[PDB]
Amino acid sequence: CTVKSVDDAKDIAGCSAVTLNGFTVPAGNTLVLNPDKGATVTMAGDITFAKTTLDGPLFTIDGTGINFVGADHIFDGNGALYWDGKGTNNGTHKPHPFLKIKGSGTYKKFEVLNSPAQAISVGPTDAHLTLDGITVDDFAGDTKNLGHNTDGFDVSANNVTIQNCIVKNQDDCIAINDGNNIRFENNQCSGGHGISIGSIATGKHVSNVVIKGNTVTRSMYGVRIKAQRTATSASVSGVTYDANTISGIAKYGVLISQSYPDDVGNPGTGAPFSDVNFTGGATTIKVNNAATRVTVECGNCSGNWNWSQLTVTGGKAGTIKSDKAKITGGQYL
Ligand SMILES: *[C@@H]1O[C@H](CO)[C@@H](O)[C@H](O)[C@H]1NC(C)=O
Ligand SMILES: *[C@@H]1O[C@H](CO)[C@@H](O)[C@H](O)[C@H]1NC(C)=O
Ligand SMILES: [Cl-]
């Protein structure tokens, strides 16, 4: 029941207490864990991934009711051996995502250090999945702006809570791409692109999202909801921003747009956004001198968007094109 190598990992059936020792995952290998229902998996060392040509994920764990106890250990992706400023858009191959977590349970207190590109992919789930006290430290990717597409958490899943986490990166802190009942609470995001829903693609539906109690600093955006201009059979419905403290924003405090990859222009109509609120505790957002406070670019949006608890200051005014939705502010114009 102690995993000391990629080959030991296949031999954990029957264990309710698995110890994951530190080792290197060699080039051309992946680390896959399929623990018994309800097993506790405890990390006892750091796992380093040698430079590899494989596609990600390089680590996959899938189980039901897993209790993952990180004990502050590290999954080291050696990202600086890949980073070239182009991420997964072009350039060198980037194994991505680095980690994949599927099923259900509670994952606590480990660090992903220097992912090649996107760090932690979440989903699908079979019951509630909680990620608590995880650090994605891709800060080294800031040097010469070489880190790219270093998303902290990419979520396509139902019934997820991500709380008490820290992300230092160059792209979305979280990107919620599909699923219902997703909570992102009491996290700290810096360096990247803020807290995102999307990009929403054809056939994807995000609903019942709570973004509460987070701090965002030194980022390109505060919060974003992005849908591909071309997406159809898609939606975002029921989003609540509550008690977020955001500052140091370079481009947009809030950008809600159906023009992606463009910020504005000819917004799409096939990925309707509805019921987007800033309520509960104040969400305060301070933007830089050249930044825009709030832009909403809707081709198809609906509902009574209560933005009473939003305050955005700094920078310049954006534009509001909310389609059928009625936005009741708040201070940001
Ligand atoms: C990748 O970069 C090359 C230029 O070096 C360009 O010709 C190609 O079309 C680019 N592709 C993407 C997908 O960005
Ligand atoms: C998981 O989400 C699915 C769809 O949201 C819902 O039907 C189900 O009740 C949720 N399960 C749990 C355990 O929350
Ligand atoms: Cl290889």
Q: Would you list the domain boundaries of the chain?
A: 1-333
Q: What's the 211 CA to ligand 2 centre distance in angstroms?
A: 19
Q: 115 CB under 6 A from ligand 2?
A: no
Does 90 contact ligand 1 (Cβ within 6 A)? yes
The highest-level CATH class for domain 1-333 is mainly beta
List beta partners, residue 207.
Answer: 180, 237
Residue 237 near residue 216, CB atoms below 8 Å: no
Q: Whose CA is nearest to atom 10 of ligand 2?
A: 159
Distance, CA of 221 to CA of 293 (rounded, Å): 10
Q: How many CB atoms lie within 10 A of CB 288?
A: 15
* Tokens found for residue 236: 């975002």
Residue 65 DSSP SS3: strand
Supply the DSSP symbol for 13.
Answer: T
- Identify the residue whose tokens are 């910020």: 263
Ligand 1 atom closest to Cα of residue 89: 14
CA 122 to chain centre: 9
293 marked ligand binding residue: no
Hey, whose CA ends up nearest to atom 12 of ligand 2?
Answer: 127
Contact 142, 121 (CB under 8 A): no
For 1, residues 6+ apart whose C-beta sits below 8 A from its C-beta are 12, 14, 15, 17, 18, 19
196 close to 169: Cβ distance less than 8 angstroms: no
Q: Give CA–CA dist 148/140, Å, rounded.
A: 11
Report, as residue numbers or ranges, the catalytic residues. 193
Question: How many C-beta atoms lie closer than 10 Å to residue 172's C-beta?
Answer: 30
Instruction: Return the best residue to mutate from 84, 86, 90 for the ligand 1 pocket (most ligand atoms within 8 A of CB).
Output: 90
Q: What residues contact 306, with CB distance under 8 A and at least 6 apart? A: 277, 278, 279, 328
Ligand 2: which of 180, 208, 209, 210 to mutate, judged by most atoms within 8 Å of the beta carbon? 180
Half-sphere exposure of 199 (CA within 13 A, CB side): 16
261 close to ligand 1 (CB < 6 Angstrom):
no
Are 268 and 228 in contact by the 8 Å Cβ rule? The answer is: yes
Q: Which ligand has an atom closest to residue 27 CA?
A: 3
**Cβ 159 under 6 angstroms from ligand 2:** yes
Contacts (Cβ under 8 Å, ≥6 apart) of 104: 63, 64, 65, 66, 125, 126, 127, 128, 129, 159
* Beta-ladder partners of 105: 66, 129
Q: Work out the number of other CB atoms within 10 angstroms of the CB of residue 71.
A: 12
The β-bridge partners of 255 are 224, 295
- Experimental resolution (Å): 1.0
Any ligand 2 atom below 6 A from CB of 48: no
The experimental method, as deposited, was X-ray
Rg (CA), the chain: 20
Tokens of 281: 């505790």
CA distance 244 to 188: 10
Cα distance between residue 187 and residue 163, in whole Å: 6
* Sign of the four-CA dihedral 7, 9, 12, 17: positive
Q: Which atom of ligand 2 is nearest to the CA of 125?
A: 1
Distances (CA, A) of 150 to 21, 88, 127, 264: 26, 9, 27, 24
**125 CA to centre of ligand 2 in angstroms:** 9
Cα distances (Å, whole numbers) of residue 134 to 49, 72, 106, 238, 268: 18, 9, 11, 26, 36
Q: Is the CB of 89 under 6 A from ligand 1?
A: yes
CA distance linking residue 19 with residue 43, whole number of Å: 6
What sign results for the dihedral spanned by CA atoms 156, 162, 165, 166? positive
289 annotated ligand binder: no
